[PDB]
Ligand code: HEA
Ligand code: HEA
Ligand SMILES: CCCCCCCCCCO[C@@H]1O[C@H](CO)[C@@H](O[C@H]2O[C@H](CO)[C@@H](O)[C@H](O)[C@H]2O)[C@H](O)[C@H]1O
Ligand SMILES: CCCCCCCCCCO[C@@H]1O[C@H](CO)[C@@H](O[C@H]2O[C@H](CO)[C@@H](O)[C@H](O)[C@H]2O)[C@H](O)[C@H]1O
Ligand SMILES: CCCCCCCCCCO[C@@H]1O[C@H](CO)[C@@H](O[C@H]2O[C@H](CO)[C@@H](O)[C@H](O)[C@H]2O)[C@H](O)[C@H]1O
Ligand SMILES: CCCCCCCCCCCCC
Ligand SMILES: CCCCCCCCCCCCC
Ligand SMILES: CCCC[C@@H](O)[C@@H](O)CO
Ligand SMILES: [Ca+2]
Ligand SMILES: [Cl-]
Ligand SMILES: [Cu+2]
Ligand SMILES: [Cu+2]
Ligand SMILES: [Cu+]
């Protein structure tokens with residue numbers, strides 16, 4: 158499988174999209190970015206021009222005005238319009254993210270200090286996922302020859318250290334996945350940037366998110382609520398695969 | 414002598430808050446240097462468990478030199494302790510004491526023509542509670558804490574159940590620290606409000622009060638509403654930890670998310686409490702150096718009032734991924750967006766003030782203009798974050814870290830430096846050297862932009878907050894951000910040199926008003942420094 162959901166060296170943009178929700182976030186953010194860049198450039202150019210035009214060597218006697226009604230009207234209404242416009246594109250994107258559709262696949266995820274537990278209620282599968290290099294895999298949260306070997310053996314490389322886990326949440330491509338997220342001890346947060354999803358894992362609460370992956374491959378997230386000593390060391394690996402490979406993985410877990 | 418610390422005069426107290434805010438600022442900045450040393454490269458090289466085997470003093474020094482990864486067992490607890498220490502010091506023991514306690518106490522009474530403040534003795538007590546709070550926060554770093562080590566690694570906002578389950582009593586000491594800070598702030602707020610209302614000079618009506626004194630007045634109101642709420646949230650943590658309550662513990666039917674509603678009800682107002690006095694200082698500085706009266710005085714006052722008020726109804730933009738319903742998320746998003754309108758009015762008015770002026774590019778004016786640009790960069794990323802659908806990606810990433818450092822470290826701090834250069838002659842009787850102030854400005858300007866701008870990229874790439882270590886792909890922009898932090902640190906040490914030079918041998922100030930006639934508030938009619946008994 159291709160490693161898709163991951164940071165890339167020197168990156169300045171989002172991680173690749175692998176869901177329609179992520180695609181929406183990329184468009185909305187791109188749209189807002191054009192606007193706020195225009196505002197910032199505008200404001201910056203006004204300041205630099207005013208300093209040049211009205212420097213004390215060039216404008217020796219200062220004006221004394223403290224009002225300009227037309228300008229004050231424009232500079233109040235135009236921001237309001239800009240914001241209404243952002244809101245209008247933004248709320249539908251929000252409604253799509255947060256309205257949970259009917260599940261093809263249901264996973265229940267539990268955050269622990271410091272690993273994730275997954276349960277597939279329809280399949281009676283459960284398992285835990287630890288960082289490759291965590292004490293669970295024999296490490297102590299740092300790179301070593303042993304950790305590199307384990308990364309290689311699991312189908313990764315040295316470059317995936319801190320992202321790759323010993324076991325992965327496996328799901329089929331182009332199917333609606335609903336994840337139910339809770340915490341076992343403290344608050345954790347489960348996320349996958351490529352899917353455009355993030356949901357706190359709060360003890361005593363069961364929250365839901367959804368995604369539908371639009372291509373196969375490997376996608377990484379990292380725990381996103383500070384949860385103690387190994388907060389930096391309990392990531393998320395999702396493998397998106399064919400419907401057939403998904404069934405094969407399920408059968409591998411079936412106890413006869 | 415210790416006639417300084419027992420003084421009740423608002424000028425002396427103001428000066429005490431400034432020096433102390435500066436010293437705590439130096440400590441918190443030094444934490445960030447160490448933080449950026451560790452973030453400079455992927456892999457953990459500095460914060461090694463091995464250094465815990467040494468003594469306190471010996472462990473400290475070894476932890477400043479890098480080790481090979483193979484000799485460095487990562488100590489996440491120390492990372493967590495350092496960033497928690499950094500945030501708490503900044504948010505409770507640095508910028509507000511400097512702006513509100515410092516400039517507020519020194520200058521607000523001067524601006525309104527008050528010879529004294531309503532409660533001088535309470536003012537002196539407010540300072541001591543600040544110092545006691547700082548002492549407890551620092552003590553917490555050396556107290557038995559999480560994971561059988563010293564200190565609390567729980568983040569500056571103390572989320573339970575993590576904060577309530579952290580072992581040792583480090584966290585209890587931190588909570589007491591914050592109680593003491595709140596008490597200092599509340600006393601100061603009561604003092605400011607009573608002074609503003611009852612002790613203005615004859616003729617000094619509401620519509621003739623300078624913008625800075627207004628900024629302090631509005632800020633004081635925010636404090637009275639916000640700080641008692643915080644006192645509740647953290648006392649509930651204290652009783653969950655020590656007195657068998659289960660407010661935030663699900664086994665006892667509690668809800669950790671309740672803590673978040675209460676905490677952020679304080680936590681948003683907190684930032685407007687930080688920034689409003691900086692808005693006031695910027696207004697005084699720009700009018701002076703543009704040689705032009707402030708554009709739209711009354712809208713400036715009302716924009717500040719509106720910002721203050723709106724800052725109480727937006728708190729859950731800090732909780733978009735914490736399990737808020739779609740309806741709550743939509744509301745808080747729309748309410749947050751509204752804040753851009755009155756802030757925009759203030760930004761455009763500052764530019765309009767400059768427009769048609771006669772601009773002098775002295776050091777205080779450079780800080781003020783840097784503020785306009787940098788606060789705008791920070792403000793617009795705040796608007797991005799207000800969008801719940803996009804915050805889904807950005808929440809608890811370095812994009813948030815970039816946002817808040819632009820508004821605070823390149824915003825409110827630029828306001829602090831603007832005030833210092835603006836007013837140091839007035840406070841001390843000695844003037845700073847102009848070339849050194851400009852050099853300080855440019856070093857900080859370049860350094861702080863190099864530190865924080867690349868953090869937007871890290872956040873877009875999905876780098877989480879509160880991580881001792883990070884995937885190799887984040888190396889480039891982490892490296893640049895760290896170099897920026899080292900340059901900023903150099904600029905701050907240079908600044909401390911500039912202050913030391915100024916106070917020991919700066920050019921003697923001989924004029925009541927050493928700027929120009931457009932510095933037209935009452936402090937400029939007094940001597941430099943003002944007499945013990947003013948007006
Ligand atoms: C001085 C401190 C300060 C200030 C002033 C602000 C100002 C603002 N903040 Fe910020 N913020 C923080 C400090 C501050 N913030 C901190 C410390 C945190 C993190 C806490 C933590 O988790 O540790 C945070 C986090 C934070 C979040 C949570 C993000 C997350 O955790 O995922 C959000 C969400 O909406 C937000 C929004 C905003 C907005 C909209 C503004 C607005 O007030 C800004 C409005 C200003 C402008 C927009 C620029 C000027 C306007 C114009 C030039 C007009 C034209 C512009 C438009 C029409 C857009 N902030
Ligand atoms: C006022 C607020 C403030 C300021 C000024 C700063 C200053 C700096 N911060 Fe701060 N930071 C916070 C508030 C602030 N920080 C908070 C609240 C957090 C969250 C903590 C948490 O996650 O719980 C945080 C977290 C945080 C992180 C993320 C940590 C993590 O997630 O693991 C990083 C990363 O580099 C960082 C770096 C820096 C650096 C390099 C500087 C500086 O070195 C930048 C350079 C600035 C200067 C050199 C000048 C500073 C001047 C003053 C402070 C005024 C002193 C007073 C007088 C002179 C009177 N900070
Ligand atoms: C949204 C971004 C905005 C950024 C702000 C920067 C732009 C500010 C432009 C100000 O425009 C000036 O306003 C004055 C006051 O309205 C006018 O003076 C006019 O009115 C004065 C008020 O009495 C008279 O003194 C003058 O003679 C008369 O020219 C003047 O012509 C006009 O150029
Ligand atoms: C019929 C049979 C009767 C059975 C009775 C036995 C009851 C067992 C008590 C359970 O409490 C445990 O205490 C450990 C020790 O405090 C904890 O380890 C914690 O503390 C250790 C340090 O002592 C660390 O090494 C671990 O990583 C950390 O999980 C552990 O989590 C916790 O659940
Ligand atoms: C019929 C009676 C039943 C018998 C009781 C069963 C006895 C065995 C329980 C083992 O407890 C585990 O110990 C681990 C090792 O201490 C802990 O790992 C914890 O500590 C590690 C080392 O610090 C971390 O890396 C992990 O992420 C963290 O979960 C883990 O939590 C805890 O559950
Ligand atoms: C593929 C490159 C994307 C460009 C990313 C730039 C983001 C900078 C955000 C901050 C903007 C503040 C005005
Ligand atoms: C990894 C071998 C190179 C050694 C460089 C050590 C730089 C440490 C300087 C730390 C400065 C303390 C503030
Ligand atoms: C693909 C094979 C499905 C096997 C199925 O019975 C299990 O997932 C449920 O226990
Ligand atoms: Ca490192
Ligand atoms: Cl007084
Ligand atoms: Cu975590
Ligand atoms: Cu907020
Ligand atoms: Cu976690």
Ligand SMILES: [Mg+2]
Pocket residue numbers: 346381382808809
């Ligand atoms: Mg969070």
Ligand SMILES: [O-]
Pocket residue numbers: 680681684
């Ligand atoms: O905030």
